[PDB]
Amino acid sequence: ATAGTVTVNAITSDDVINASEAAGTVAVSGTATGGDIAEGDTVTLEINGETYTTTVDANGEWSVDVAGSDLAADTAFDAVVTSSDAAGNTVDTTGSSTHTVD
Ligand SMILES: [Ca+2]
Ligand SMILES: [Ca+2]
Ligand SMILES: [Ca+2]
Ligand SMILES: [Ca+2]
Ligand SMILES: [Ca+2]
Ligand SMILES: [Ca+2]
Ligand SMILES: [Ca+2]
């Protein structure tokens, strides 16, 4: 199974968590394409110790709702996509993210 490419978009529009954003939910999004990445593959983010999970959509994108407070506590994390090939061999693809907190 071949790793693709995973990217994480800016954490909110300016890549900064402010006090309002920390108080609520924030959608963390990104892409997952290439290699053996497919729709339905799991996307795992560990943020401030909490594991957040979604799946890759039909267009190579993903989004997961995260506690803003977790993002205010943890300024760097990976998104890890687990994929399989046609024989069931598995592979993880990792993309990294950083942000700041106001
Ligand atoms: Ca912001
Ligand atoms: Ca944990
Ligand atoms: Ca971290
Ligand atoms: Ca597959
Ligand atoms: Ca960033
Ligand atoms: Ca500040
Ligand atoms: Ca400020």
CA distance 65 to 9: 13
Q: Which of 56, 50, 45, 51 is nearest to 83 (CA)?
A: 56
Q: What is the resolution of this structure in A?
A: 1.4
**CA of 99 relative to ligand 7 center, distance in Å:** 14
| CATH architecture type of domain 1-102 | Sandwich (2.60)
Cross-strand partners of 51? 46
Every domain of the chain and the residues it spans: 1-102
Q: Which residues surround ligand 6, an ion (CB under 5 A)?
A: 102
Neighbours of 17 (CB within 10 A): 22
CA distance 55 to 6: 12
Q: How was this structure determined?
A: X-ray
Cα dihedral 69, 71, 77, 83 sign: positive
24 is in an annotated binding site: no
39 is in an annotated binding site: no
Strand, helix or coil for residue 45: strand
CA-CA distances (angstroms) from residue 98 to 11, 55, 83, 87?
A: 8, 21, 24, 35
